[PDB]
Design a protein around this ligand. Sequence first.
Ligand SMILES: *[C@@H]1O[C@H](CO)[C@@H](O[C@@H]2O[C@H](CO)[C@@H](O)[C@H](O[C@@H]3O[C@H](CO)[C@@H](O)[C@H](O)[C@@H]3O)[C@H]2NC(C)=O)[C@H](O)[C@H]1NC(C)=O
Ligand SMILES: *[C@@H]1O[C@H](CO)[C@@H](O[C@@H]2O[C@H](CO)[C@@H](O[C@@H]3O[C@H](CO)[C@@H](O)[C@H](O)[C@@H]3O)[C@H](O)[C@H]2NC(C)=O)[C@H](O)[C@H]1NC(C)=O
Ligand SMILES: *[C@@H]1O[C@H](CO)[C@@H](O[C@@H]2O[C@H](CO)[C@@H](O[C@@H]3O[C@H](CO)[C@@H](O)[C@H](O)[C@@H]3O)[C@H](O)[C@H]2NC(C)=O)[C@H](O)[C@H]1NC(C)=O
Ligand code: R16
Ligand code: R16
Ligand code: NAG
Ligand code: NAG
Ligand code: NAG
Ligand code: NAG
Ligand code: NAG
Ligand code: NAG
Ligand code: NAG
Ligand code: NAG
Ligand code: CA
Lengths: 49, 49, 930, 49
Amino acid sequence: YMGKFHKACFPNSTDAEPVGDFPCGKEAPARLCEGDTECREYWPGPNFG
Amino acid sequence: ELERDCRGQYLDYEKEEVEAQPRQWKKYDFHYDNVLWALLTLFTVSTGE
Amino acid sequence: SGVNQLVDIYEKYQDLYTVEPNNARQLVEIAARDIEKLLSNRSKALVRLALEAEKVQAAHQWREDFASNEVVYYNAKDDLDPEKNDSEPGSQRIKPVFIEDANFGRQISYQHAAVHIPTDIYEGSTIVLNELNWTSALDEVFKKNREEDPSLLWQVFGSATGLARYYPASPWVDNSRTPNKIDLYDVRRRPWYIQGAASPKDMLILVDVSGSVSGLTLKLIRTSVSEMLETLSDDDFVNVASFNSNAQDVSCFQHLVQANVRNKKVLKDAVNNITAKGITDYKKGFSFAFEQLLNYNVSRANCNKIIMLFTDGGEERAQEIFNKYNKDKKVRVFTFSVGQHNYDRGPIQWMACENKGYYYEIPSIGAIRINTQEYLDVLGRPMVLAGDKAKQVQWTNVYLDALELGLVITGTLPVFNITGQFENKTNLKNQLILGVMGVDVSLEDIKRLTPRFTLCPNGYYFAIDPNGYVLLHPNLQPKPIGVGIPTQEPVTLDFLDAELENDIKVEIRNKMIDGESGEKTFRTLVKSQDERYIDKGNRTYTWTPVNGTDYSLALVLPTYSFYYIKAKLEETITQARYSETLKPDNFEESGYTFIAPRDYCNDLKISDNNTEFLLNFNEFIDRKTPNNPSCNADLINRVLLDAGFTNELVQNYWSKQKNIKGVKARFVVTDGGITRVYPKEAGENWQENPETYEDSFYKRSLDNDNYVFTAPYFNKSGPGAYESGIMVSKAVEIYIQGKLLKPAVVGIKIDVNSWIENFTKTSIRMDCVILDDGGFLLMANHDDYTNQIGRFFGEIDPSLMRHLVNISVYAFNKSYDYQSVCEPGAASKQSCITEQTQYFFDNDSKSFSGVLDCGNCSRIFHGEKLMNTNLIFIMVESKGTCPCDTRLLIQAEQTSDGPNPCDMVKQPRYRKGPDVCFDNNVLEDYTDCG
Amino acid sequence: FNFQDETPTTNFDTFPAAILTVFQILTGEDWNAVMYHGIESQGGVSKGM
Ligand SMILES: *[C@@H]1O[C@H](CO)[C@@H](O[C@@H]2O[C@H](CO)[C@@H](O)[C@H](O[C@@H]3O[C@H](CO)[C@@H](O)[C@H](O)[C@@H]3O)[C@H]2NC(C)=O)[C@H](O)[C@H]1NC(C)=O
Ligand SMILES: *[C@@H]1O[C@H](CO)[C@@H](O[C@@H]2O[C@H](CO)[C@@H](O[C@@H]3O[C@H](CO)[C@@H](O)[C@H](O)[C@@H]3O)[C@H](O)[C@H]2NC(C)=O)[C@H](O)[C@H]1NC(C)=O
Ligand SMILES: *[C@@H]1O[C@H](CO)[C@@H](O[C@@H]2O[C@H](CO)[C@@H](O[C@@H]3O[C@H](CO)[C@@H](O)[C@H](O)[C@@H]3O)[C@H](O)[C@H]2NC(C)=O)[C@H](O)[C@H]1NC(C)=O
Ligand SMILES: CCCCCCCCCCCCCCCC
Ligand SMILES: CCCCCCCCCCCCCCCC
Ligand SMILES: *[C@@H]1O[C@H](CO)[C@@H](O)[C@H](O)[C@H]1NC(C)=O
Ligand SMILES: *[C@@H]1O[C@H](CO)[C@@H](O)[C@H](O)[C@H]1NC(C)=O
Ligand SMILES: *[C@@H]1O[C@H](CO)[C@@H](O)[C@H](O)[C@H]1NC(C)=O
Ligand SMILES: *[C@@H]1O[C@H](CO)[C@@H](O)[C@H](O)[C@H]1NC(C)=O
Ligand SMILES: *[C@@H]1O[C@H](CO)[C@@H](O)[C@H](O)[C@H]1NC(C)=O
Ligand SMILES: *[C@@H]1O[C@H](CO)[C@@H](O)[C@H](O)[C@H]1NC(C)=O
Ligand SMILES: *[C@@H]1O[C@H](CO)[C@@H](O)[C@H](O)[C@H]1NC(C)=O
Ligand SMILES: *[C@@H]1O[C@H](CO)[C@@H](O)[C@H](O)[C@H]1NC(C)=O
Ligand SMILES: [Ca+2]
């Protein structure tokens, strides 16, 4: 589980705070998200990291 | 802080964008208003949750 | 161009018109009388409404049951759907029939008044229901007022319970029921309500930035101070101090400064940049407050001294500080216990009692909005007790209307609670106002009392506040005032910022503020309309005070504009043969015609699409005779006379020739409105405004009694410069009865190629450039500069630009535009202060020579100013030399911050405050510390 | 524990609040939320774990 809680899906390149306090994944079994969002790196994590 | 007052609408600043929400005179989930409700509330307290 | 042919045509028909004088004194007196009559009409309406409101609230019976007797009213934020289920228990809602009105531009119902209730206020409580019950007499008097004066705009009762009841029932603007369009409007924060609810303040916000206010408390304190500053007008003086064992100013201001947009922004930034640290000391802070309220060296409003204490709580009362500094109790103290905490709140509630103040609590954001309105509720006690000496009509700064109408000024009058009066009872809350009545006057309604079309396009009216702001000015646009760099305030534009500022204009401004009358003829730098040139004008300011108000009217008038041509068109057939020229089917013997969209007749609606307006103008001219009182005969007579003269020019001198190699377009523009451009081909490339009085070249060419060449715009997406040409113009200067009057301009749109060939033709008998006023490249020889034609020369080779300025052939003026749209940067488009500069001929000399001392090189130039035009020729011979292109001289509307406010408050502009104000009554009952 | 936007009720400001917080951690319920608050108070995860 190393570093898997850091991909949160962020708005469309707006560089704002991520939407949702849950990790995501761009792959199939992981939690996909919705609404013009991209699951990219550099989110501190849940519970303030 | 009264049922007379708690009517109409109000502005909620929780989302960081102003949104008008209804005013509801609600009761808490575990509420001691009876010896059967107090028994359940005290049971949930004793289980620690 | 044929200046002489148009001239001698004009003198050829002296029997067709009469020359009349513009007696500026009588014009100013007449317009001042008209404006005072308008404002007195609105004052009478306000007096009627306030009298009826007081009478009908005096005879109201309080109730707690409205189920048995419903209140019937129209709520502004009601959806148009016929929903029978949108009614409160105690209120039945009206569904109105909405017509479209020209005056308002919205759906308007004259059958009843509408009501606005803020979202944060429940619309069926007892207070609201009682107010909605007793405001029906207000509805009836609304009807009566509009019935005696059909020109009234919004007339409104701003209740102190939160309501607002304006007469022409119109749906609320965009915020009835719309996602992302939340309705934060509250009548008690509005500038007119803030103004009529009390007298000018002298605040001093003590913010308690100590250790114990870190976290949420400091957030709420800074938001609360921002929302407190947002309730201060331009008649109010405020500073913000902050204390933690040591009291200091939060900003660069050292004393009480005026609460205008710039100073309020500076204070808001300082409060937002504030941090919490250290131990509290309520004595060193109130000492600072009471010392700053004892400063009389600075400009102030000597009235309503206040201290706003933004703390949380503590065990310190500081009795001796108050007993030393506030012993006669001349200064109020409003204490705010901001935050969600459990500190002691006893001393906080006691400071308000012993200092005539009041105690407010702000536990969270959302409680911030209501408490500011509430200190202002407290401040109006001395005003109430002065029965009829406090009922005086006051007009607010120019602001943008909520129910969008453009720019308006509101006239306020407060309404007093008179339940127990001459039958004296306990009179518990008879010290508070019921509300404020306002009636709006459209700024475009004031503009119609100052007829502008009998003056030169350079002559105009302007009015002024006592603070120097302009009620009326050609440079006042319906946009909010910019306050800095982008990242419901009033439109407060000073007189010295609507024009160019000399010292003579400062003397004139000071004379107008004092309410005197006089005349002054002098020489002025008059900036051109396109904000790209400066001409050396010749003006004559005459001013009078408008009696009964605080406004002062003035009339700018050029020295040559003392006479105007009065059209003597009474033949009914001559005007017809003039009119026949205007249908857009004869645009091949006569030029492509555009008509100024003026108010010739009310049945004509002006159109941005000009040919549409031309079509309706021809249509109305076809059947004109029965419409005698429907509209003004003078405008149509003059425009038809000018059309006839223009036709006689375009046939008898332009149609006899048909073609010149050099020219690309021949045009004549006349003050009546005729701007016929000949070839009808360049008329598609024509991009000048149909109204001649807003044509930059026309206004420029009248002050300048010579040939003026307007360099086309660079890098502008459109017809461009090559296939349109470059503008050339000179103004006709006819003489009738030995009087100088200039009725029109003729011009040529010289083609760029036909000039470049002739310029390079003589080169056998490379760097040569032609510059006009403002240092713009009209045309050159290198053929790569001609690619960037019309572009500012400083952008081409800035080193020569700086040097040629250094000889002082080009002086420059840098000014500020506070009403300009602005691209937002990083730390759609917001509004900022843009800092526009314009160049012109500093000296009158004709020959200039020298050496350009480029870095480690040398360059030579010679400058010659072409006689009888605004051009200078520069013979500089140096290309691709060592790089002296360090920076650029970019003459462009550059985004900037305004003048440094920390330096402009130590020599503030002269300003006359309100005379009468009400504070410190002895009958006031202070035992309501809340 | 005077964070932005909030101040937790389970804080160690006074003695009653500290004693109640220690009692709540002893019973075991929601000790992790108090841990997160006490880590965020001593600087970020970066420097206060
Ligand atoms: C460059 O091209 C031609 C060069 O021939 C310029 O036109 C000529 O300008 C001179 C100026 O002094 C005139 O003499 C030429 O003839 C004049 O034509 C007018 C026509 O109305 C007569 O009234 C005069 O008496 C005189 O005979 C004139 N020739 C032509 C064919 O125009 C041209 O202006 C210049 N380009 C630009 C942009 O100015
Ligand atoms: C203008 O002032 C008058 C009096 O100065 C106000 O009328 C008074 O309002 C109070 C409410 O603040 C009334 O008291 C209430 O009476 C009802 C019924 O008796 C009771 O159920 C309430 O608990 C409360 O005690 C009072 O009767 C009423 N009239 C008088 C003569 O005092 C009036 O409200 C003021 N105007 C506005 C717009 O508030
Ligand atoms: C706007 O442009 C005008 C152009 O006239 C500028 O006014 C001119 O400014 C110069 C520079 O200060 C003045 O020269 C000074 O004259 C005094 C008095 O003789 C002399 O003692 C100084 O040493 C200096 O030479 C010049 O007189 C003045 N023109 C007039 C008609 O007064 C103006 O400065 C520009 N800027 C602004 C903000 O107006
Ligand atoms: C209107 C009364 C409804 C009461 C419903 C309460 C649900 C649970 C009843 C009591 C639960 C007992 C828990 C502890 C037993 C030792
Ligand atoms: C920002 C990420 C790296 C920061 C440096 C490491 C800090 C975490 C180590 C401390 C964990 C404390 C709990 C130890 C329990 C045995
Ligand atoms: C204003 O009043 C003064 C004195 O009362 C008078 O001299 C002046 O003519 C008045 N102006 C107008 C426009 O009525
Ligand atoms: C003021 O009202 C009167 C009648 O009420 C009207 O005749 C007059 O034209 C009004 N004045 C203006 C400036 O509209
Ligand atoms: C107040 O309500 C009563 C009962 O509905 C009504 O008779 C009365 O006209 C109302 N007051 C006004 C000023 O309309
Ligand atoms: C104002 O803000 C700047 C930048 O954040 C900061 O360095 C400065 O300390 C602030 N002013 C005060 C008085 O703290
Ligand atoms: C005001 O001016 C006087 C004399 O010029 C000076 O003594 C005083 O310190 C100044 N400031 C205040 C606050 O009075
Ligand atoms: C107006 O211009 C004339 C000449 O064009 C000049 O003599 C006069 O001084 C100017 N007016 C003023 C007030 O200087
Ligand atoms: C202007 O109105 C005329 C007449 O109806 C029409 O032919 C033309 O297309 C209109 N142009 C624009 C830009 O609306
Ligand atoms: C011109 O340039 C010199 C030095 O380059 C500078 O000292 C001077 O202020 C400039 N302006 C004038 C008007 O001489
Ligand atoms: Ca403290």
